[PDB]
Enzyme design. Structure first.
Site: not given
Lengths: 245, 243
Positions: A8, A92
């Site tokens: 990420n 997230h």
């Protein structure tokens, strides 16, 4: 279960920095049995996808819950597929707690992306106060329920457990702490979905994953890989991709 | 007389694809547009680099949102530095959909605006009041509060009559002019008369080929932030609304 490592990049990226990461990935020696994903900022999704071999997944860091509409600043799964990208990270911790996305919204986004043919890394996890209050499972199960509620197929889902207290802080969960949560979530899947889905679904660990700790975390029976933060911007990422071998 | 350059931005919102973007780019490229109009389009973020490559620099290409630092741990956010990196010099900030659906605060919009400007990106800064705010008599209170959180050569203000947008009511050109005049008077007193005279305040209610010329004639309306019509041939007529 096939080992799965996602990088990420968060809000980090530029043509120069992206090319450096692409060169690193292209020339790296990676275990061929590991599934590898990177997630660049949205502006760079089409170019990163064009430049990286299809061996690597290229994921959006967020998307919305319908194909089109009056949602200034949002992008849809249809747009991701239009530029060749078939993965998205949803829920997230930064989106939930900084940008205020609700459990319900994350569930709607997940159901929509799956319906559109986009694979989803669905993120869950508890804050420090919740952990200290004994509410880790309560929180993870509440977040999982909002994702599970309207889903009937799980073959295009990866679950990512990131304790919020471990994100960006260097305070990695111990391998025992990570194993305990992954096993609890997998057993939740056994009773709430099916034992078959529980046995096959990847549950990956996020939150201060480093070259130094990835191999101990990876050997835990219910840890199936990683969602990597800051180390995905570094050569250390390749060592994490190789944590299972 | 006033001497502000007419400004029309087309906000594509969450609409776009390689195929449909190419059709709009073709339409924009070959249209007869008033050469004295400043024209901007705002595609979804995935398409910003390619739209910027395909469209002549005569057209601005804007992001529909950005964040408030150059880089960091903000999964799903993009920064002004990244916009400059892909050749885009504009961003829309504080759009009513971001404020009211995506829950952006006045303070966050102000922080984003200041940061975008600091990074070298021009900002369309959006303000406007909802129906119960207007009915409670808070039109100016809301617009001025939103403006204060931001508080200019790289700013365009967009007034959105959310009380009309979200309800099906039609705002009249007199109602638009009234708010634009109030906002300009706020700029005159809280910034300076020089900035007030030069800053463009564009109208972000429903604009179509049928109403654009009458709205454009208003003395304190300097152009439009266009919604749905930016995806359609109406956009060219709206770009030409002042001439």
């Amino acid at each position: 279960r096939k080992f799965f490592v996602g990088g990420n990049w968060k809000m980090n990226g530029s043509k120069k920095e992206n090319d450096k990461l692409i060169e690193m990935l292209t020339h790296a020696k990676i275990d061929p049995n590991t599934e590898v994903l990177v997630a660049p900022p949205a502006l760079y999704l089409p170019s990163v996808r064009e430049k990286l071999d299809k061996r690597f997944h290229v994921a959006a860091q967020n998307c919305y819950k319908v194909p089109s509409g009056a949602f200034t600043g949002e992008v849809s799964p249809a747009m991701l597929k239009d530029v060749g990208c078939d993965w998205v990270i949803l829920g997230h911790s930064e989106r939930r707690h900084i940008l205020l996305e609700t459990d319900q919204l994350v569930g709607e986004k997940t159901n929509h992306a799956i319906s559109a043919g986009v694979n989803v890394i669905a993120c869950i996890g508890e804050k420090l106060e919740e952990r200290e209050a004994g509410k880790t499972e309560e929180v993870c199960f509440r977040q999982m329920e909002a994702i599970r509620k309207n889903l009937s197929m799980w073959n295009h889902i990866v679950i990512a457990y990131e304790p919020v207290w471990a994100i960006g802080t260097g305070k990695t969960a111990t391998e025992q702490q990570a194993q305990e949560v992954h096993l609890a979530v997998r057993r939740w899947m056994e009773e709430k979905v099916s034992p078959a889905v529980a046995k096959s679904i990847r549950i990956i660990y996020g939150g201060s994953v480093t070259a130094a700790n990835c191999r101990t975390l990876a050997k835990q029976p219910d840890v199936d890989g990683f969602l990597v933060g800051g180390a995905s911007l570094k050569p250390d990422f390749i060592e994490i991709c190789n944590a299972n071998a």
